[PDB]
Amino acid sequence: STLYEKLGGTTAVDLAVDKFYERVLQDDRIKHFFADVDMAKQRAHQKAFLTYAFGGTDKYDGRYMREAHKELVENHGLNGEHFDAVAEDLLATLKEMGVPEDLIAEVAAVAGAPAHKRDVLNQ
Numbered sequence: 001s002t003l004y005e006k007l008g009g010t011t012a013v014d015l016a017v018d019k020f021y022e023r024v025l026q027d028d029r030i031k032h033f034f035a036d037v038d039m040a041k042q043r044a045h046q047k048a049f050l051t052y053a054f055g056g057t058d059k060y061d062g063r064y065m066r067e068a069h070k071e072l073v074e075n076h077g078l079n080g081e082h083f084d085a086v087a088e089d090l091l092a093t094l095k096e097m098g099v100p101e102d103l104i105a106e107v108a109a110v111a112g113a114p115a116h117k118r119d120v121l122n123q
């Protein structure tokens, strides 16, 4: 199954989520998409994204993805350049964790997959 077991338990998951959260928070390309939400919810998001990318797709229905990002698309100007910045932040986090470049490619293909990018971007 999912995230806890793929990364190797509680501490490892928290490490991945915190590093990802940190990088995105400091990323001027995209930090503003989180301006109207609290810090706890910003981290919860990076956790969700990470879970998805590692293969916990199940709980993130495309229709829910479309709706969940609709205000970003309509109100914050969310586009593909932004989507890519977040994907790239995740992969940079996993590299900074020593995760193998092949295995980063595996999640890179998931997180950045056309049907999901299409849903997030309200294409």
Ligand code: HEM
Residues within 6 Å of the ligand: 030, 033, 034, 037, 041, 045, 048, 049, 050, 052, 053, 060, 065, 068, 069, 072, 078, 082, 083, 084, 086, 087, 111, 116, 120
């Ligand atoms: C792997 C791709 C992604 C998945 C699976 C995903 C999933 C989610 C989910 C499940 C929520 C809902 C949180 C909630 O309802 O409590 C959410 C919210 C959000 N996502 Fe994503 N997301 C993805 C990519 C992105 C990207 C690329 C951005 C760009 C910044 C983004 C920005 C946001 C924002 C701003 C919210 C709303 C925060 C809030 O109001 O709670 N997401 N996303």
Ligand SMILES: [K+]
Residues within 6 Å of the ligand: 008, 009, 010, 011, 012
């Ligand atoms: K543990």
